[PDB]
Every structure is written in C-alpha cells, then in structure tokens.
Amino acid sequence: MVSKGEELFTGVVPILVELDGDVNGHKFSVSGEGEGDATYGKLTLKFICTTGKLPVPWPTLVTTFVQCFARYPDHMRQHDFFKSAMPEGYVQERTIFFKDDGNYKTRAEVKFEGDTLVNRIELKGIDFKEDGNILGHKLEYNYNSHNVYIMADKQKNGIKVNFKIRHNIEDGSVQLADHYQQNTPIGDGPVLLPDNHYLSYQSALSKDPNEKRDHMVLLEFVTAAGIT
C-alpha cells in the first residue's frame, strides 16, 4: 500500500524556504521558492538574499537549502524516513565544520503548510576567519556530486546522517565541509527507521539573468541507493 507520507509526494509540490542566519555577527536572511518532484528526485529552487549582499558564499548554503524529495527506489520504500514523517514533519539539525575555518550550526523544521512543503531554518556560524575562504568569498560558484550516508538512530526515533562536501576554491584547491546531521520527527506517530543506505546527489548552480538581487538558482537531483 502507499503510505500517507508517500501519497503527499506523488506529484509536483511547491516549496518555500526561509532562513535567518548570523555568521560571525554578519546577519542575513534568505527566502527561496520552487518545486520538488520526488518521483524523479528533482528539486528546482531560487533563493534571494532579502537583506542585501550574502556575507558567505552561496555554495556554502546549498546543503542547508528538503530530503523528503529524494527518489527512493520502490525496493527501498521502507527506508524513506523523510516522507514517513509527513505531513507533521521533522526537525533537521546539522553541524558543518569547515576545515581550517569556522562552523555552521543549523536547525530546520520541514513540514507541510497546506499544499506547500516549507523548510524554516536558523543558521549560526562562529569562529570564521574574516579573510578565509568563506568570509573572504574565495569559493567558486559551482558544486560537486556527493553521497550522503544515512543510518537509523532508534533511541531518538530518527536518523543520523554524515557526509563530506568539497567546495572548489578559486585557486584550484578544496575547502572541505564536514557535515554531521540528525533528524527527528515533529509528531508522535510512527516513522520508518531505515537500514544503512545513502543518497546520491548532483547539483547545478546558476544565475537568473534578469535578477538584480543577490541570489542563487539551484537544480538538484537526489536518488537513494545502497540496498539491493
């Protein structure tokens, strides 16, 4: 049978993202809009910095900016924690350690508001070098493909997730961003606790040629794998 959580994702779903951030005291807010098509694991989003210039590189926010849109193969449906938590939603927490630099801590609540899937986020960054790759804006506007590793966290009725992002620096080098993540349901109902598996991501960043505000257009594809 198709679960209630699954049923909410069979078509194209509008997405709204709202983020308030503060990195080394540089405060900023971002709004995003677009749509997700989980059947194809496809996300299309545009983000706008509503407070002016973004004080960090857009690529460092890609992972923060709705894993319920991953394409889970039919044979892995019992391992899709994200959709099983819907519509009441889940809380996603991360610490992101930028190697030889600062860290972001994020807390996001992801849930439906009517037909819209909403991701509301607070991000706090500390201990950045004011002339490092982040605050010094030395990261290229591009993005590599990565795997994201998921395991059950039964004692917390959720999942633990880990992965490494490599951001290309403008000199040809790499800025590593080590991600540690936990998700927990917002409601008190049952969820699916997965066997170990991963999501495969590929992301493309672009600009809207007609947009004068600081912004990022994101096209992302996400597919679950690792269990056959």
Report which secondary-structure segment, H or E, holds 157. none
Kindly state the tokens that stand for 125. 């960054």
Quick one: 1 exposed, middle or buried, by C-beta within 10 A (0-12, 13-18, 19+)?
Answer: exposed
Kindly state the tokens that stand for 117. 């899937």
Kindly state the tokens that stand for 171. 């000199």
Q: Resolution (in Å) of the shown entry?
A: 1.6
Closest CA to 101 of 202, 195, 23: 23
Q: How was this structure determined?
A: X-ray
Quick one: 220 exposed, middle or buried, by C-beta within 10 A (0-12, 13-18, 19+)?
Answer: buried
Report yes or no: 10 and 3 within 8 Å, Cβ to Cβ: no
Kindly state the tokens that stand for 94. 């991360």
Which class is domain 1-228? mainly beta
Closest CA to 181 of 209, 208, 153, 140: 153
Quick one: 194 exposed, middle or buried, by C-beta within 10 A (0-12, 13-18, 19+)?
Answer: buried
Q: HSE on the CB side for 107, CA within 13 Å?
A: 3
Question: Domain-by-domain residue ranges, the chain?
Answer: 1-228
Q: Give 71's DSSP letter.
A: B
Please spell the DSSP secondary structure of 113-144, one letter per residue: ETTEEEEEEEEEEES--TTSTTTTT-B-S---
Report which secondary-structure segment, H or E, holds 6. helix 4-7
d(CA 21, CA 123): 5
Kindly state the tokens that stand for 87. 């519509």
The answer for residues whose C-beta is within 8 angstroms of residue 92's C-beta and 6 or more apart is 67, 106, 107, 108, 109, 110, 181, 182, 183
The answer for residues whose C-beta is within 8 angstroms of residue 33's C-beta and 6 or more apart is 14, 15, 16, 17, 45, 46
Q: In Å, how far from its chain's centre is CA 100? A: 23
